[PDB]
Design a protein around this motif. Structure first.
Motif, PDB file in Angstrom:
ATOM      1  N   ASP A  10      -5.964  -6.055  -3.977  1.00 27.23           N
ATOM      2  CA  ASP A  10      -6.298  -4.774  -3.203  1.00 27.23           C
ATOM      3  C   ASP A  10      -4.782  -3.777  -3.529  1.00 27.23           C
ATOM      4  O   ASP A  10      -3.979  -4.030  -2.688  1.00 27.23           O
ATOM      5  N   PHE A  11      -4.990  -3.111  -4.394  1.00 24.19           N
ATOM      6  CA  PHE A  11      -3.688  -2.302  -4.643  1.00 24.19           C
ATOM      7  C   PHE A  11      -3.266  -0.989  -3.475  1.00 24.19           C
ATOM      8  O   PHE A  11      -2.492  -0.393  -3.338  1.00 24.19           O
ATOM      9  N   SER A  12      -4.544  -0.824  -2.832  1.00 28.96           N
ATOM     10  CA  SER A  12      -4.246   0.168  -1.694  1.00 28.96           C
ATOM     11  C   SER A  12      -3.269  -0.311  -0.421  1.00 28.96           C
ATOM     12  O   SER A  12      -3.000   0.429   0.501  1.00 28.96           O
ATOM     13  N   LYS A  13      -3.231  -1.556  -0.467  1.00 28.93           N
ATOM     14  CA  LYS A  13      -2.354  -2.028   0.514  1.00 28.93           C
ATOM     15  C   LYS A  13      -0.913  -1.902   0.354  1.00 28.93           C
ATOM     16  O   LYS A  13       0.242  -2.050   1.057  1.00 28.93           O
ATOM     17  N   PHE A  14      -0.366  -1.353  -0.946  1.00 28.24           N
ATOM     18  CA  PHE A  14       1.151  -1.164  -1.186  1.00 28.24           C
ATOM     19  C   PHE A  14       1.296   0.254  -1.526  1.00 28.24           C
ATOM     20  O   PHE A  14       2.196   0.810  -1.610  1.00 28.24           O
TER      21      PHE A  14
END
Lengths: 247, 247, 247, 62
Positions: A10-14
């Protein structure tokens, strides 16, 4: 097979992300490249040719044709195409295509060469027919017309088929060496980088020579290392001494 | 998987064609190369070794053995084999083979080296046994005998098995660099191109040194980048200063 | 598919052998590398950057900070990370990740860079967060702390995730060029070899310049040759003239 | 034993290469042997082999 799946993180957490779709041409190109990579073993051979008389003669021809008023621009890729056509004439094995089952080889007697042309949508490979029976001026005129057509985005399906030896030139951007990917059904592909003034040993002391690096990828199922080395050496000799085109 | 099929294009619509079959050896080699390419990730490392004292000493040995009448020719590939054997002695990990499942590594204590020999049918890989316990003259004599046997096409099945480190030399044809393909069950493979007189910086000014380019492909499942770099550096040091073979 | 099985040869018939098992981390790394190799087509681009003012300025900063007593060591990999971050800022396409199906591209707005660190167990890739909003001293201090933590074998799972551009530096071992393997979900990877004093043509005569070779592997499904060439040229320009970091 | 080798101190002496003398670190070696088993020619050949091996150590592998 039994390989691990693609990592899903999940790239949205960074940080902020923006997911976008891909065009049909991009998807087709990616699928073709993946299939070629997983089906064709690549053995890239690197070399550097000595191009000092060829560039000087090209600029001489341009300056002498400007006076005659011809509106024709001569590029080194034309000479590269001529050398490739001569090498294909000398070795018919590279001018062929391996069948799907890998048991039958379809040799070709004609010589049509694809050329990598940069477009705002990426790269295209228009094919020039019969490069071994055309002159430098005619090839340059056809190349200029094809480049103008491609930069306008009007290439047709009939000009994108029939190739036998794709040539990828990226000397106007950078890089000293790069290994391209052979595209089916072609057997070999030649990549050209940027030319640099390097010291070359002649026998007594180093002299500045305009060396051009050339890479050559090929399918190892049909071509072995020795044949590829001989082919790239023939191309190197033709490009270093263009006068061999008539001999 | 779910990749696109191989492109089937009727090549007869563009010119004359000639479809021919392939030999059994060619098919077996192609299948093996395809399997190795799709099963072994290749990480090619390139380097250039300084070979000026080694070539001079080799020519000195040849000219001094011509007087003694021995009918033995000494080639640089013998010294390359000796350096490879020394490097395998120093690092036993490269002298091994990964199992089919990729979970068990079979380390090897013996050192047998395969050598690429050119034949009219392509390339062959005869194996020399115990390269770390033989001299230069004995290795040269065995290499000459094996090359004579191979050029006559009389190699047996017993001389084509037991290898641990294939060496591909194509310095007599051309190329400045090339990336070979690791062949199972071997872990690493070394490729040798043509030696060239290049300027090398010693600390004050450039001097002409006969640099030989060497490439090293290996399986990334067993060998990482650091180990491959150390291995190729050890080979470079052994080839640049051959006197380390006794130290 | 229908490829030949892995060659099973009884290695005990040629000499002593020692079969050993592999660790869990080694197996996971091998599986990931195999999956990346069989799923990602690699097109390695090679280049050489001119690093003479950067190294001199780095040594000047070190010698001027030793007097001020800071206990901070500045390494060229910090400048490489800064150049990579600047290039990712200029081209957002390389700072992304391709989905499993290869139809959706997840662009990234943040810039976190992984760094290859040598450990007794092999290589690790700790990730530094926000490299485009940090200074040289802070990055150097964080790198020193992370290297000390890694050499002690105490890296956590939170410091091994979130990377976007792995950088593999092996200049302390050898090699003049090497082609790394792109690791999912990253798109591109940069490899750095050893810097050498080479003659470079300025326009009148060759001068000794400390050239550093850099290789760049990338997925050909998302990045074509032209974009990769432009990206590596931007990195080359940033590393050759570091003053562009503010311009 | 049949033979014995003695080694003295090495000195920088001028050696003729073909054009002019150059300074070379020459090491003197003496070799005594029993004349009942070894004649002059064999001893000369043996000491010459030792001289060649010491002057060009790379012969240890050749």
């Amino acid at each position: 097979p039994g390989m691990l799946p693609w990592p899903k993180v999940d790239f949205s957490k960074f940080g902020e992300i923006e997911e976008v779709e891909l065009g049909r041409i991009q998807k087709i190109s990616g699928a073709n490249l993946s299939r070629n990579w997983v089906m064709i073993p690549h053995v890239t051979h690197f070399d550097k040719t000595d191009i000092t008389e060829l560039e000087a003669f090209r600029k001489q021809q341009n300056e002498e044709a400007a006076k005659r008023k011809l509106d024709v621009k001569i590029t080194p890729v034309v000479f590269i195409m001529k050398a490739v056509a001569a090498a294909l004439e000398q070795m018919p094995r590279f001018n062929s295509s391996l069948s799907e089952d890998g048991q039958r080889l379809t040799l070709k007697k004609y010589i049509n060469i694809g050329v990598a042309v940069d477009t705002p949508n990426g790269l295209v490979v228009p094919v020039f027919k019969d490069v071994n029976k055309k002159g430098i001026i005619e090839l340059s005129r056809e190349l200029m017309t094809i480049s103008k057509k491609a930069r306008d985005g009007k290439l047709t399906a009939g000009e994108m088929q029939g190739g036998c030896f794709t040539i990828s030139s990226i000397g106007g951007l950078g890089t000293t060496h790069f290994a391209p990917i052979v595209n089916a059904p072609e057997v070999a592909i030649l990549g050209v980088s940027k030319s640099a003034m390097e010291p070359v040993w002649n026998g007594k002391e180093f002299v500045p020579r305009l060396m051009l690096p050339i890479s050559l990828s090929f399918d190892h199922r049909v071509i072995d290392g020795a044949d590829g080395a001989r082919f790239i050496t023939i191309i190197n000799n033709t490009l270093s001494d263009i006068r061999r085109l008539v001999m």
